[PDB]
Design a protein around this ligand. Sequence first.
Ligand SMILES: CCCCCCCCCCCCO[C@@H]1O[C@H](CO)[C@@H](O[C@H]2O[C@H](CO)[C@@H](O)[C@H](O)[C@H]2O)[C@H](O)[C@H]1O
Ligand SMILES: CCCCCCCCCCCCO[C@@H]1O[C@H](CO)[C@@H](O[C@H]2O[C@H](CO)[C@@H](O)[C@H](O)[C@H]2O)[C@H](O)[C@H]1O
Ligand SMILES: CCCCCCCCCCCCO[C@@H]1O[C@H](CO)[C@@H](O[C@H]2O[C@H](CO)[C@@H](O)[C@H](O)[C@H]2O)[C@H](O)[C@H]1O
Ligand SMILES: CCCCCCCCCCCCO[C@@H]1O[C@H](CO)[C@@H](O[C@H]2O[C@H](CO)[C@@H](O)[C@H](O)[C@H]2O)[C@H](O)[C@H]1O
Ligand SMILES: CCCCCCCCCCC(=O)O
Ligand SMILES: CCCCCCCCCCC(=O)O
Lengths: 324, 324
Amino acid sequence: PDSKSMNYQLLKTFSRQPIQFGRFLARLLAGLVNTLKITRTSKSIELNLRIALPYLTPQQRIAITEKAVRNELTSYFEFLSIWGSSNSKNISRIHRIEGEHFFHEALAAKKGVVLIVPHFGTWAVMNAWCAQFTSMTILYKPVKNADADRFVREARSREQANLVPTDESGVRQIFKALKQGETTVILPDHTPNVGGDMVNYFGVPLASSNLSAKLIQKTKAKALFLYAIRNENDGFTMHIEPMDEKIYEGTADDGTYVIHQAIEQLIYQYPEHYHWSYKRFKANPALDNIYNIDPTEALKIVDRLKAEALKTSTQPEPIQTSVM
Amino acid sequence: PDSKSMNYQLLKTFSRQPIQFGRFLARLLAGLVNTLKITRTSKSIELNLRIALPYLTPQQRIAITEKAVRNELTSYFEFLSIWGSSNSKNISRIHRIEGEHFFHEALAAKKGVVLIVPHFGTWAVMNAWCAQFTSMTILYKPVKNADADRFVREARSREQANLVPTDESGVRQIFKALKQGETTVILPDHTPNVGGDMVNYFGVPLASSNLSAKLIQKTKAKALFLYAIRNENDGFTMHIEPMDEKIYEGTADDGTYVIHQAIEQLIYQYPEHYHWSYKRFKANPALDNIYNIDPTEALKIVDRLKAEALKTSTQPEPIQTSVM
Ligand SMILES: CCCCCCCCCCCCO[C@@H]1O[C@H](CO)[C@@H](O[C@H]2O[C@H](CO)[C@@H](O)[C@H](O)[C@H]2O)[C@H](O)[C@H]1O
Ligand SMILES: CCCCCCCCCCCCO[C@@H]1O[C@H](CO)[C@@H](O[C@H]2O[C@H](CO)[C@@H](O)[C@H](O)[C@H]2O)[C@H](O)[C@H]1O
Ligand SMILES: CCCCCCCCCCCCO[C@@H]1O[C@H](CO)[C@@H](O[C@H]2O[C@H](CO)[C@@H](O)[C@H](O)[C@H]2O)[C@H](O)[C@H]1O
Ligand SMILES: CCCCCCCCCCCCO[C@@H]1O[C@H](CO)[C@@H](O[C@H]2O[C@H](CO)[C@@H](O)[C@H](O)[C@H]2O)[C@H](O)[C@H]1O
Ligand SMILES: CCCCCCCCCCC(=O)O
Ligand SMILES: CCCCCCCCCCC(=O)O
């Protein structure tokens, strides 16, 4: 009787679509199979977990890898439902919130609020809820495909999000919004398309955005660390956590490192909910090709590198922050 | 602008489903990724094409393999739409029919009609159309999953198909229906679960059903060879072709071989429309593990085997039909 290798509701919904729908979807899936994109993604997830969580045993690593594949794909289907739904419904999708106090307090302080959202869990579900208490200005990068871009921006417009370009005009508009006491959402854990700073990530110096830290340290806005995880029964639990006050100290690179620590701790606790498909660890000049070589050699290069970042740090010369 | 890496209608339909739908579908897809079923299927398609069409060049073989992956997946989504639709709509899905004359003539003869349908193209689309001219009795094997079985049988009941078990009681009911001048549909190109006859298939002796030939040679029913191919624009072209009269001669094994020839010719003409995922070539005691070993060694074993089936055939002893 081995089970739920389909549901009848599923089959009936697919069955009621036009033939064109099925043909287009099959062409999409087949394109994914024929170009090996699915295998490539699975292997990048596996390598990333080997890099960041080297203490897992082979068995634990298999369970986590399989669950992370499942969970990230699930998150993206969930995003489809979220971006097809009204604000009311998306708000009612939040069943439990932890740390709401810090959000309302940060809004009371009227110094601005920077919501720091890693690519983790079902993060797109939080926006509707946040939006009922504050205006939000958000960096937006148009999706490469026009129809998808279209869809996403109906979603964001329904949320009343103020979308701004991912360039210095968008950054200026975010500074302005924070000055007025409003809110922005930054996902800080991808590699910037242009620039910037070599900041350690799981012990590996990686080129990293400084945006969060620059906004926070200049405006003295409050920084909150946010994430949402699906519940056993169709709901989500949202978590709001204040950023360590160290984030205000030092250079933007120092604050960036504090954000990195928060991300690391979240992953350590919930490794199966991080979105591991992204090829983050390529962002070092020694690591440009680690997703394209033999996984074991890749790991040896990474280990060499983490080994040098320690002594060059006790050493007074800035080896690891030098960009060439 | 590279394109139709999604459509907006697609995204909006997925977006309007409940969150449960997305979670269940992602769990399904992820299960497929995590158990390597997708890679395994792709490799079985590739091996089957190497076995049956050894004259293809590597480039031609890649184009055909990719198109066959696309086309079989497309066929199954099309089956979903067909089995969710009314008879009227499914009939209007047939835009062009070739050889309709032979079908109406076979019904006029009132000796019964056996429709021989390879697993090819979009074969499930033909049933509704056939059903408006004749009653149909069909072998049915319950789908392993209960919900899917459910769905499929609403589809067949709406078609007024008389489903019968895949055992000798079903065979007796099909004989009875043919005696009355009615029609049956047999898909003859899979390996039987129990028995039977070593019949050459692309030069390889494979255990094969004899059902079609036994029905046809006893009842003298007319045998028609049927297949449907999707058109450029959302329709399908159906093809009805009389079976070579040799099918009436000799043993059931001889008639089975005539069906095999018809299938071979259809594949030679339309290799991209055959459903190549099925592991048909395992059905020989020398070939039990060819989908699980190195593809080149597999092909060497197959070539050895086709090499012996020739001389043992000119030789008077029945080497290849001996079942042990
Ligand atoms: C219909 C097929 C089934 C549906 C599921 C398809 C999964 C598609 C995921 C492909 C890989 C991720 O694809 C990537 O997703 C992110 C969101 O994370 C998009 O990001 C886009 O939306 C987010 C949030 O509104 C913005 O912050 C971002 O600026 C914008 O570019 C990227 O533009 C897209 O390239
Ligand atoms: C100029 C920096 C030099 C260092 C680069 C070295 C190698 C890079 C390692 C990982 C880089 C992956 O390269 C690319 O980065 C961009 C921009 O962040 C990603 O884009 C992604 O991040 C941005 C920022 O949150 C999101 O708006 C978007 O949803 C997402 O898809 C691309 O999906 C990825 O293909
Ligand atoms: C919701 C996910 C997306 C939908 C697409 C899913 C593709 C599923 C295909 C899996 C592999 C094929 O799965 C197989 O299909 C054939 C039809 O060809 C089914 O066959 C079933 O229906 C046919 C026609 O009504 C009958 O002749 C047969 O007796 C019956 O068992 C098998 O019971 C099933 O095991
Ligand atoms: C007892 C015969 C001894 C020879 C067997 C030697 C190895 C077999 C090689 C290929 C066998 C594959 O083994 C199995 O055959 C059965 C029955 O036909 C298939 O079942 C399939 O064929 C039947 C007959 O049309 C369809 O009703 C059904 O839709 C389809 O899924 C299974 O999908 C396949 O898993
Ligand atoms: C610790 C692993 C590196 C961080 C980057 C993960 C972000 C996932 C976003 C999904 C995607 O766009 O591919
Ligand atoms: C010439 C290749 C062998 C014939 C069997 C193909 C039938 C495909 C049915 C699809 C499936 O059930 O896996």
